[PDB]
From Swiss-Prot, chain A:
Its main location: nucleus. It comes from the Eukaryota. The DNA polymerase activity domain resides in the N-terminal half of the protein, while the C-terminus is necessary for complexing subunits B and C. Catalytic component of the DNA polymerase epsilon complex which participates in chromosomal DNA replication. Required during synthesis of the leading DNA strands at the replication fork, binds at/or near replication origins and moves along DNA with the replication fork. Has 3'-5' proofreading exonuclease activity that corrects errors arising during DNA replication. The keyword DNA-binding applies. The gene is POL2. This is DNA polymerase epsilon catalytic subunit A.
Curated annotation (Swiss-Prot), chain B:
Coiled coil: none annotated. The gene is DPB2. Transmembrane segments: none annotated. Present with 3110 +/- 251 molecules/cell in log phase SD medium. It holds the Pfam family DNA_pol_E_B. It is found in: Cytoplasm; Nucleus. Phosphorylated in a cell cycle dependent manner during late G1 phase. Phosphorylation may facilitate the interaction with POL2 or the activity of DNA polymerase II. Phosphorylation is independent of DNA replication but dependent upon CDC28 in vivo. This is DNA polymerase epsilon subunit B. The modification Phosphoserine is found at residue 454. As accessory component of the DNA polymerase epsilon complex participates in chromosomal DNA replication. It is required during synthesis of the leading and lagging DNA strands at the replication fork and binds at/or near replication origins and moves along DNA with the replication fork. It has 3'-5' proofreading exonuclease activity that correct errors arising during DNA replication. It is also involved in DNA synthesis during DNA repair. Its main location: cytoplasm. One of its GO terms (biological process) is DNA-templated DNA replication.
From Swiss-Prot, chain C:
One of its GO terms (biological process) is double-strand break repair via break-induced replication. The gene is PSF1. The keyword Cell cycle applies. CDD domains: GINS_A_psf1, GINS_B_Psf1. InterPro entries: GINS_A, GINS_bundle-like_dom_sf, GINS_Psf1, PSF1_C. Required for DNA replication. Functions as part of the GINS complex which plays an essential role in the initiation of DNA replication by binding to DNA replication origins and facilitating the assembly of the DNA replication machinery. Required for the chromatin binding of CDC45. One of its GO terms (cellular component) is DNA replication preinitiation complex. Component of the GINS complex which is a heterotetramer of SLD5, PSF1, PSF2 and PSF3. Interacts with PSF2. This is DNA replication complex GINS protein PSF1. It comes from Saccharomyces cerevisiae (strain ATCC 204508 / S288c) (Baker's yeast). It is found in: Nucleus. It comes from the Eukaryota.
From Swiss-Prot, chain E:
Present with 10300 molecules/cell in log phase SD medium. This is Minichromosome maintenance protein 5. Belongs to the MCM family. Acts as a component of the MCM2-7 complex (MCM complex) which is the putative replicative helicase essential for 'once per cell cycle' DNA replication initiation and elongation in eukaryotic cells. The active ATPase sites in the MCM2-7 ring are formed through the interaction surfaces of two neighboring subunits such that a critical structure of a conserved arginine finger motif is provided in trans relative to the ATP-binding site of the Walker A box of the adjacent subunit. It comes from Saccharomyces cerevisiae (strain ATCC 204508 / S288c) (Baker's yeast). The chain holds residues 518 to 775 of 775 of the full protein.
Amino acid sequence: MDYIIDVLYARKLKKENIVLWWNEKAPLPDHGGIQNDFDLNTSWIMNDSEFPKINNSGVYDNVVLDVGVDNLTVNTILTSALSNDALNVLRGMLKEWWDEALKENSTADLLVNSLASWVQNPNAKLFDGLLRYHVHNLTKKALLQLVNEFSALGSTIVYADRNQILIKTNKYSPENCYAYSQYMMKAVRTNPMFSYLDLNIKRYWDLLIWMDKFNFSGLACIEIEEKENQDYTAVSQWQLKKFLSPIYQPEFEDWMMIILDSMLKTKQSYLKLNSENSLNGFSHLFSKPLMKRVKKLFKNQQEFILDPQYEADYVIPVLPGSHLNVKNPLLELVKSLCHVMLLSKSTILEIRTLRKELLKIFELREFAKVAEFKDPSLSLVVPDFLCEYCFFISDIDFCKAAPESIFSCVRCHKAFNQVLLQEHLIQKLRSDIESYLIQDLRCSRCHKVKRDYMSAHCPCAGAWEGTLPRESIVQKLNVFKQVAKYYGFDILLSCIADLTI
Amino acid sequence: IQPPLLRPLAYRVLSRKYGLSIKSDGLSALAEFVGTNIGANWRQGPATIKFLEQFAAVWKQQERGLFIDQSGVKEVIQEMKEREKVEDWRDYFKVINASQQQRFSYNPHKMQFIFVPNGGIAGFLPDIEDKVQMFLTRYYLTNDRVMRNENFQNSSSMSITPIKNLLGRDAQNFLLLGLLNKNFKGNWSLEDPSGSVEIDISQTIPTQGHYYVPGCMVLVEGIYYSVGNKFHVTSMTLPPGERREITLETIGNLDKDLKIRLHLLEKELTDHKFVILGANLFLDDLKIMTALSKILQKLNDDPPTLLIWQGSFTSVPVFASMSSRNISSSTQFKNNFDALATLLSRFDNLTENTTMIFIPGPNDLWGSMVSLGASGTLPQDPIPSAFTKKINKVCKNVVWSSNPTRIAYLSQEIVIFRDDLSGRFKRHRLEFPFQKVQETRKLVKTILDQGHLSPFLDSLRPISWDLDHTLTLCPIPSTMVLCDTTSAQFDLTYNGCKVINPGSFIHNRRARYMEYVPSSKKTIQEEIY
Amino acid sequence: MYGDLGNKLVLEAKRTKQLYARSNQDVNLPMYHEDIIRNILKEVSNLRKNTEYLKEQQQLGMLDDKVAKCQYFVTLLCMERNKRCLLAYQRLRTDILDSMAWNNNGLDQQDTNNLSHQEQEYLKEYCDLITDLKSGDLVDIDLSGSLVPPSDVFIDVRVLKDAGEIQTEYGVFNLIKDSQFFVRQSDVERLIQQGYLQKI
Amino acid sequence: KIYPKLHQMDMDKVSRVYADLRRESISTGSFPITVRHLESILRIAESFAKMRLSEFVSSYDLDRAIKVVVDSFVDAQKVSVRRQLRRSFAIYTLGH
Amino acid sequence: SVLAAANPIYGRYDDLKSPGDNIDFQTTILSRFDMIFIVKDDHNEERDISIANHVINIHTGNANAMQNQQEENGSEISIEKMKRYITYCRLKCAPRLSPQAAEKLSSNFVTIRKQLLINELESTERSSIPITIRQLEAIIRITESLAKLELSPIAQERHVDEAIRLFQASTMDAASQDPTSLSEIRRFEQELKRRLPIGWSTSYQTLRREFVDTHRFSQLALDKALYALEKHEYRSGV
Ligand SMILES: [Zn+2]
Ligand SMILES: [Zn+2]
């Protein structure tokens, strides 16, 4: 119904002295006469329209996945009211719709929900690239203000998705804090002049081992909040654990349950003592079983290797995320274990002790780059992807998310069609290609920008370095090809075939 | 067959003649060749001599006795012999994409240093050197054509003065050649490899024969006023162009008897029809579909030797749709391309001994994804090969090429490009404080004399850095096809070269395609509906 | 002053010929100095332009041949000097070309970049002519035959580089790396021409 | 008679060591760290190996040399940063 | 040809300090010796790692040998006969050192002179005594440095002398940007940015607004502004 949004906005503008920019022939906004002028700003507004994500990988005593605010675009544009003329007209229309969005027909609510999509939909006319970019920037400042507001509270934002916001509380306080957490987040949301953000804090994690969206060990989600009494089983996608060899995957998962149980037990021990030191005790607790099972597994691998039946299972499945060397996949297992352990800052010394023990188990230098993990993510993401049925706005990560996760969005059961997925992926890819074609050079010593079309080396002593060349764009093209083998993607296949030529 | 007997024979034939080394294995090769000679090996001597001469001419390598590469040498020899016992128009007129044309770079030592374009996934992406050298190459071609033209004017006329040498003296007058652009101070700046100077647009008379837009080279005369630091140019003249024949004779023979033979053949050639439908053909409209069907019926009577399909094949821009209407816009774009292939093949004389050339447009995808209504980079991206399917098999003569398409004509040269450059000129025509036919003549003079197809700043329109050689008017074709929907349709000849403007497919209410006879050197336009 | 440009050119040419001559071995032909060549080309064109001005000069008022014709004759002297300098340089170039042709194409700067086109086909056709001399009559002797008197036909030679077997007139011979081989002089000479043999 | 030789060595261990050395001289209590300091560490390793009396340097003896040098550096720092720096280098200290 | 050895002040170069404090030597001596050069703090912990690798490699005999032979076969080519060649080729210096220079130098010499004028433009208030004589030592420097570069091993004088003069220009600019040196322009860009986010509009519109399209501010004051801003504010990374 974004065309209805177009006709209503046209009616609203016709009321004012300014006149609509609607143009059926070209869905691009029709401002002035050109409607087609191209410059650096023209590509600037359409591109980089992705929600920035803040991630702090760690393990914490009391973590809450929190409310998980939705439809932040309309909330932000309403809160902005607390070019400028079009902004004021749109703010008045949005306030009118919000008044209609409350205690009225469901059509008003649907129109309010789809207004955000219309603001970003190129197919819908009266769509301005400046409008989309400015709404994106407003959402950026909204996330910044939310972060600042959370900063005042004695809690740290360990993750930020702009769809779900993740904060852990510094204090080791028990169950009563969860009710106190609800009271404090009520107090937090009451303070600013907003009312459109999602309430009902949810999915608190009594323990969380935060790596990324897909690797975590959150426990005891939203409930009567008894602090692990009704312990929800640790939800753990493990997009890296899937990467692993199918035989080493159960071992890694079993040991991460063992690790989780050990840290939990040390957590009750520390809580009883008080009536991350708990993690520090946990480290010494699981050190002996870890080291004993490591060599055991290494000793087994000594004969396990060179077995045609075993090597068929031992081969690491080829996944779009990683390009690391094989490096004895069992060694990959212990390196991944180190990485997931390295989150706890206090235990990092004990983690170093365990690494020294392991390099005694298998010969290797105490500190080594080869011993370093350097896990590749290779996340291919379309900025601010939307599901027309659900109207939710969220970046969709094709490589990292599960095969059905790309297909079906989390909010509503409706599944994304493949054609739009390929269209958006190719959109980002080539848009980056022209960006590569329209960059501005940067010097070596002075580091100025290429204000000169006839430069031939900087007027500074240094030459023009540059920012982002072709080679890793080509490897990204190779990742696109790998996805194309993974997912049919005939439009993507055609795009790849064209790009090769 | 009997190597040792051939051993001294082959030694005499090869080693004594050329000092060439033959292995036992290649000598065995010659042995089975003698075996293939059913007759006794007497005239194999001359045969082996011709073998040696061909090997020396082609391979130019030691160790001929390979029997592997030597086997290929034997195959080439028998092909040549078969050609010995047995003792064009389609070879020329080839359609080349933007990247197909060989790259050329200016060099003071060698007037045009040979370069190479790029069909590689890594190769097609331009480089930092490509960034600097596209600008530098425009300037160098401008400088060399200007110095040749100034030699022509007077041993030469007034000479340009290095921007750096300008400011050294305040009140002195100088000749300049540089690229005009807006200075970040706010003034109009003329920029060359030596530097850049802000230009006082006052007291400046333009040359009425040429357009003038930012991002163009220019020959100017005036005072600099080093205290004022802005060049008080008096007279402003676009850099004079050079005729294709004059450019060739200045740069020497490059790829006379062959050219004159091809010219005679083309003059012998008759009724070769070059048909251009016109700008912005739309496959969506049914009335336009019927008009195009009637046009194809007309072309069925005489299949044109050239057919041009213009940009914006679809009526409205095609692009990604997250709010899909259960069917992607790209799917309609594909179906529109698939359609009319049967219509082309339905008419039997049509699409037989014919060629259809397609030009991308802003409404076309890969040119609408970059910018829905607008066009993207200056060398426009052709449609995906997937959208080319079943129309390439139904119609064998359809050619999918980028917007800067060229034809390597045997007696002439034809450059095909579609854009609304007239609108860009009009919105960028400069005012100097100091008619359609006339303005088209001025546009033609501007395009030819400036020596670039689209002399515009890369910021205004993205230009392929490694492909900038094509965007420069290095060849100066005798005939150049430039389709401007905005501009009035016309055909004009300038500096010994003809410029043809197909214009819109339908001017006001009637379909209209051109027809051109290269031998007759005249363009005719018909009307339908 | 006009020949001074030619003077620098001929000094450069004498430097090149000294460089080649001092080394008995082959010297790769240096880059063709077409910069100076073209400079002299413009000078001679403008020299011709000034000669035309002398003709028109007279047609107008420089009718004092004693003076005007003297000036024209002087111009003639300058242009002849330039021409003779260019002839000397080009002849020296061609002598180098013939030397290299005999030493490489006849005895068997491979790159032509140092060489201009005209002289490229010149040297190619000169090699063809050499072959023609080899062709037909005098085929019995090698037109580019070794100018050293033959010492001994049978000599032992160690293989410089391993290149497998190479067929001789009658005897099989494998070029096994560093293998002594005591045979007639023709084969060893021709392989020295390719350099696959050594140490005599 | 004894001349221990660095035939075996830990390149990247020393690399990370000098890396940590960096962005610490920014401290007001921290003196600049230079290449000659690294050469000093190397010669301290040589002195340790000579002290071990083996004709071949030992990797772990070289590790104790690293430990001694880094401890000297830490002592050179201001006590305020000294604690933060000692925690930072604790990832190196345990290996000795 | 004297090669100096002076650690300017307090040991370190102290580029972020006034050149008079930095250069204990009198600037007249600097001009008369005609050369200027800087060693600064590299930082670049990755490059520091690589330097450590190189130093240990040359330090450990087993690695030392392979770098030694690698340098010898291609580059280090018997340093003694490098000295022999240097003697022979300084005998080859003397014959001629500006055949190819003349035409290009006729422009580039006055070019570099103009960039020196640019430098005094950034160094208004004279930036004290040290910066004034640098232009004269530089104009003599070009003349002596073309001969220094010899035309390279052969006939490559101007094309590289341009880069070398650029290197020297920025060398002095690291000390001639201010009389605290870079610290003063850093303070300038800070007292600039103290309004840019909170006020001073955004996106060049404010620059089109204040001082009537900043025209009076543009020629000198705004240029000084951007020269300070640029350091703190698709070809190399990806
Ligand atoms: Zn949905
Ligand atoms: Zn610079």
